[PDB]
A paper describes a structure:
The transcription factors p53, p63 and p73 play an important role in cancer prevention, development and longevity. Tetramers are formed via a short tetramerization domain that follows the DBD, with a short flexible linker region separating the two domains. Here, we report crystal structures of different p63 tetramerization domain variants, showing not only marked similarity to p73 but also small differences that may be important for regulating the function of p63 in vivo.
The crystal structure of the long variant was solved at a resolution of 2.15 Å. The crystals belonged to space group P422 and contained one monomer in the asymmetric unit. Like its family members, p63 forms dimers of dimers with D2 symmetry. The monomers consist of a β-strand followed by two helices, H1 and H2, the latter being absent in the p53 homolog. The H2 helices from one primary dimer reach across and clasp the adjacent primary dimer, with the two primary dimers packing in approximately orthogonal fashion via their H1 helices. The last four residues of the construct used for crystallization, Gln399 to Gln402, were not resolved in the crystal structure, indicating a high degree of flexibility.
Numbering used by the authors:
A (entry chain A), B (entry chain A), C (entry chain A), D (entry chain A): 359 to 398
């Protein structure tokens, strides 16, 4: 599952894309059930 | 802390913005320490 | 092409998701060629 | 205005973050007036 590199001009954007990236990656630390109970 | 409504034209976009929204909200279920240990 | 509604808790998030949504929608105002010349 | 580098694990994510990044950068090719007329 590839390690790819995204160049970002602008710290404001970079920090936003970073935010999004992390929160997406950090979701695998939650049980599938929690993520499901959060939706309903 | 306001409840706001974002109208989305397109299911492909909506599902992306949804994805991002959830993963951002679902991060409060993780310890601040986990989020920190994930960064380093 | 559906009009869907995304509820957002938090103005900081809403404004981010809004930003992303707009910039994605506003890209249809550019020529496909511009978007392509921007990539290369 | 810094050039920063965001490493992404996963092509699906990378392509999403790329999408967002581009559409945000590609908005400077539109007149401020267009972006404003799009909002109202």
């Amino acid at each position: 599952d590839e390690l790819l590199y995204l160049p970002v001009r602008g710290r404001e954007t970079y920090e936003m894309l970073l935010k999004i990236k992390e929160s997406l990656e950090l979701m695998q630390y939650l049980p599938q059930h929690t993520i499901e109970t959060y939706r309903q």
